[PDB]
Design an enzyme around this catalytic site. Structure first.
Site, PDB file in Angstrom:
ATOM      1  CG  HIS A  52      28.956   0.051 -33.707  1.00 57.21           C
ATOM      2  ND1 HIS A  52      29.879   0.945 -34.205  1.00 57.21           N
ATOM      3  CD2 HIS A  52      29.067   0.108 -32.361  1.00 57.21           C
ATOM      4  CE1 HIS A  52      30.534   1.505 -33.198  1.00 57.21           C
ATOM      5  NE2 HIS A  52      30.054   1.020 -32.071  1.00 57.21           N
ATOM      6  CG  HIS A 103      30.214  -4.838 -31.833  1.00 59.36           C
ATOM      7  ND1 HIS A 103      31.347  -4.694 -31.057  1.00 59.36           N
ATOM      8  CD2 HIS A 103      29.272  -4.047 -31.274  1.00 59.36           C
ATOM      9  CE1 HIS A 103      31.100  -3.840 -30.077  1.00 59.36           C
ATOM     10  NE2 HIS A 103      29.843  -3.437 -30.179  1.00 59.36           N
ATOM     11  CG  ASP A 133      26.184  -1.562 -30.627  1.00 60.49           C
ATOM     12  OD1 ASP A 133      25.915  -0.444 -30.123  1.00 60.49           O
ATOM     13  OD2 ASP A 133      27.362  -1.955 -30.614  1.00 60.49           O
ATOM     14  CG  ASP A 155      30.405  -1.520 -26.445  1.00 65.06           C
ATOM     15  OD1 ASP A 155      30.203  -2.234 -27.462  1.00 65.06           O
ATOM     16  OD2 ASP A 155      29.992  -0.345 -26.429  1.00 65.06           O
ATOM     17  CD  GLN A 189      44.010   2.403 -31.749  1.00 67.85           C
ATOM     18  OE1 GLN A 189      43.877   1.570 -30.837  1.00 67.85           O
ATOM     19  NE2 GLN A 189      43.031   2.705 -32.610  1.00 67.85           N
TER      20      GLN A 189
HETATM   21  C1  LIG Z   1      39.841   0.671 -30.057  1.00 68.60           C
HETATM   22  O1  LIG Z   1      39.554   1.488 -31.213  1.00 68.60           O
HETATM   23  C2  LIG Z   1      39.960   2.793 -31.288  1.00 68.60           C
HETATM   24  C3  LIG Z   1      40.689   3.421 -30.263  1.00 68.60           C
HETATM   25  C4  LIG Z   1      41.080   4.758 -30.398  1.00 68.60           C
HETATM   26  C5  LIG Z   1      40.749   5.471 -31.540  1.00 68.60           C
HETATM   27  C6  LIG Z   1      41.237   6.857 -31.664  1.00 68.60           C
HETATM   28  N1  LIG Z   1      41.855   7.255 -32.807  1.00 68.60           N
HETATM   29  C7  LIG Z   1      42.249   8.539 -32.637  1.00 68.60           C
HETATM   30  C8  LIG Z   1      42.902   9.323 -33.663  1.00 68.60           C
HETATM   31  C9  LIG Z   1      43.353  10.590 -33.631  1.00 68.60           C
HETATM   32  C10 LIG Z   1      43.936  11.045 -34.903  1.00 68.60           C
HETATM   33  C11 LIG Z   1      43.914  10.162 -35.902  1.00 68.60           C
HETATM   34  S1  LIG Z   1      43.165   8.709 -35.268  1.00 68.60           S
HETATM   35  N2  LIG Z   1      41.909   8.959 -31.448  1.00 68.60           N
HETATM   36  C12 LIG Z   1      41.289   7.895 -30.799  1.00 68.60           C
HETATM   37  C13 LIG Z   1      40.780   8.056 -29.431  1.00 68.60           C
HETATM   38  C14 LIG Z   1      41.525   8.788 -28.505  1.00 68.60           C
HETATM   39  C15 LIG Z   1      41.002   8.957 -27.205  1.00 68.60           C
HETATM   40  C16 LIG Z   1      39.743   8.408 -26.885  1.00 68.60           C
HETATM   41  O2  LIG Z   1      39.143   8.510 -25.649  1.00 68.60           O
HETATM   42  C17 LIG Z   1      39.640   9.399 -24.655  1.00 68.60           C
HETATM   43  C18 LIG Z   1      39.021   7.700 -27.839  1.00 68.60           C
HETATM   44  C19 LIG Z   1      39.536   7.522 -29.114  1.00 68.60           C
HETATM   45  C20 LIG Z   1      40.059   4.846 -32.578  1.00 68.60           C
HETATM   46  C21 LIG Z   1      39.653   3.514 -32.460  1.00 68.60           C
HETATM   47 MG   LIG Z   2      26.811   1.158 -28.923  1.00 65.17          MG
HETATM   48 ZN   LIG Z   3      28.800  -2.160 -29.027  1.00 62.04          ZN
END
Ligand SMILES: COc1ccc(-c2nc(-c3cccs3)[nH]c2-c2ccc(OC)cc2)cc1
Ligand SMILES: [Mg+2]
Ligand SMILES: [Zn+2]
Length: 303
Positions: free
Chosen positions: A61, A65, A100, A210, A262
């Site tokens: 951030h 960004h 941010d 964002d 992800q």
């Molecule tokens: C684009 O960048 C990212 C996207 C998703 C994540 C993310 N990472 C994990 C993990 C669980 C266990 C180990 S890592 N969960 C998320 C995640 C799941 C759902 C979301 O919104 C509903 C929000 C976040 C992190 C970064």
């Molecule tokens: Mg923000």
């Molecule tokens: Zn931002």
């Protein structure tokens, strides 16, 4: 440079590693979207440099960004000519640059659990109310009022556009906003001339900008995720130090589950976000296409 003049028009443009080129990239986008004779150049430049100074050296951030998010907004605006007013376009690009300001690499949830003084001042959308406060403070510095040629009414108007847009980057708000917009789409009731509706569309645009790391080409998306997790995991460390078990996304011990995390985010947030955006603004389709391609890449990692 010629390569940048060409490729800056692509939704998946990456702004590169040369920091001293980013201010000029922003000015270029401002001048293309809003005209050259609408900000005094020296004042705009002074404003940009003070904004840069008030961003911190955090993994994600950060100043890079801010300009990246602004570029996504530039691409949306360039491909939806005639929809947004001159003031809206100026306001939105500035909001993206500033959204941010003074981010420490920690969520609102962490500020609340820490009992940080910002959370007493601003109980909801804590950091975002702070980002806006910082924006106003910079605008009030001598020689930094980039809106000084606007009337008092237009000044108030653009600051409200900016306030709403910055607050909208609180992802907590996205879920409810997208739900309302999707109902308006389904029922044919969305009215861009209705200010309440219009504010919601702008809010979705801010979310889309964002989150735009997931709309880049895979090498950029994958590399950017490293930076996002560097912050999340540091926050999880800080949670543990407060004696609170962090959520998996913030817990470095859970990093083997990144691809599954992800998937969760793309299914629950990103794909719906860009799908709804494309429904309202069809020319934003490249964002959705790129998002779908990245979802496929994460599925491949799992396979
Ligand atoms: C684009 O960048 C990212 C996207 C998703 C994540 C993310 N990472 C994990 C993990 C669980 C266990 C180990 S890592 N969960 C998320 C995640 C799941 C759902 C979301 O919104 C509903 C929000 C976040 C992190 C970064
Ligand atoms: Mg923000
Ligand atoms: Zn931002």
């Amino acid at each position: 440079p010629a390569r940048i003049c060409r490729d800056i028009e692509l939704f998946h443009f990456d702004i590169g590693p040369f920091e001293n080129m980013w201010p000029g990239i922003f000015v270029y986008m401002i001048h293309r979207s809003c005209g050259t004779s609408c900000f005094e150049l020296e004042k705009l430049c002074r404003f940009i440099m003070s904004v840069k100074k008030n961003y911190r050296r955090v993994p994600y951030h950060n100043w890079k960004h801010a300009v990246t998010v602004a570029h996504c907004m530039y691409a949306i605006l360039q491909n939806n000519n005639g929809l947004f007013t001159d003031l809206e376009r100026k306001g939105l690009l500035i909001a993206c640059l500033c959204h941010d300001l003074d981010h420490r690499g920690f969520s609102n949830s962490y500020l609340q659990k820490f009992d940080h003084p910002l959370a007493a001042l601003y109980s909801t959308s804590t950091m975002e109310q702070h980002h806006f406060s910082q924006t106003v403070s910079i605008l009030q510095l001598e020689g930094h009022n980039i809106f000084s040629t606007l009337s008092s009414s237009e000044y108030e108007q653009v600051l409200e556009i900016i306030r709403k847009a910055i607050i909208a980057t609180d992802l907590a708000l996205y879920f409810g906003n997208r739900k309302q917009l999707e109902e308006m789409y389904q029922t044919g009731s969305l009215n861009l001339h209705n200010q309440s509706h219009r504010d919601r569309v702008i809010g979705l645009m801010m979310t889309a900008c964002d989150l735009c790391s997931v709309t880049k080409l895979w090498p950029v998306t994958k590399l950017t995720a490293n930076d996002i997790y560097a912050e999340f995991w540091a926050e999880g460390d800080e949670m543990k130090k407060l004696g609170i078990q962090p959520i998996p996304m913030m817990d470095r011990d859970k990093r083997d589950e990144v691809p599954q995390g992800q998937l969760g985010f793309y299914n629950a947030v990103a794909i719906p976000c860009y799908t709804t955006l494309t429904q309202i603004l069809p020319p934003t389709e490249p964002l959705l296409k790129a998002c779908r391609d990245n979802l496929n890449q994460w599925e491949k990692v799992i396979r």
